[PDB]
Amino acid sequence: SIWDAIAGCEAGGNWAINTGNGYYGGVQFDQGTWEANGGLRYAPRADLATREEQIAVAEVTRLRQGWGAWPVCAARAGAR
């Protein structure tokens, strides 16, 4: 599960994280990217969605934007 490695890197495995840094949840989505990739179907923000829902949105994001959406952590997880 590559996303668990990304989430350990981005958020120490805390999929509910909401620190106030402009990013949300396990893979540290900004709000614009959450919304642009269909996130509002699941929850108001990434950190309010479940791990599985955040992953679904992350799969679409990765397809649309590439692994460059996660600049260091994608590589740390082995990424394509």
Curated annotation (Swiss-Prot):
Places the protein is found: Cell membrane
Lineage: superkingdom: Bacteria
Coiled coil location: none
Residue pairs linked by disulfide bridges in the UniProt entry: C9-C73
Transmembrane segments: none
Subunit architecture: Monomer.
Family, as annotated: Belongs to the transglycosylase family. Rpf subfamily.
Role noted for this protein: Factor that stimulates resuscitation of dormant cells. Has peptidoglycan (PG) hydrolytic activity. PG fragments could either directly activate the resuscitation pathway of dormant bacteria or serve as a substrate for endogenous Rpf, resulting in low molecular weight products with resuscitation activity.
Protein name per its UniProtKB record: Resuscitation-promoting factor RpfB
Organism from which the protein derives: Mycobacterium tuberculosis (strain CDC 1551 / Oshkosh)
Encoding gene per record: rpfB
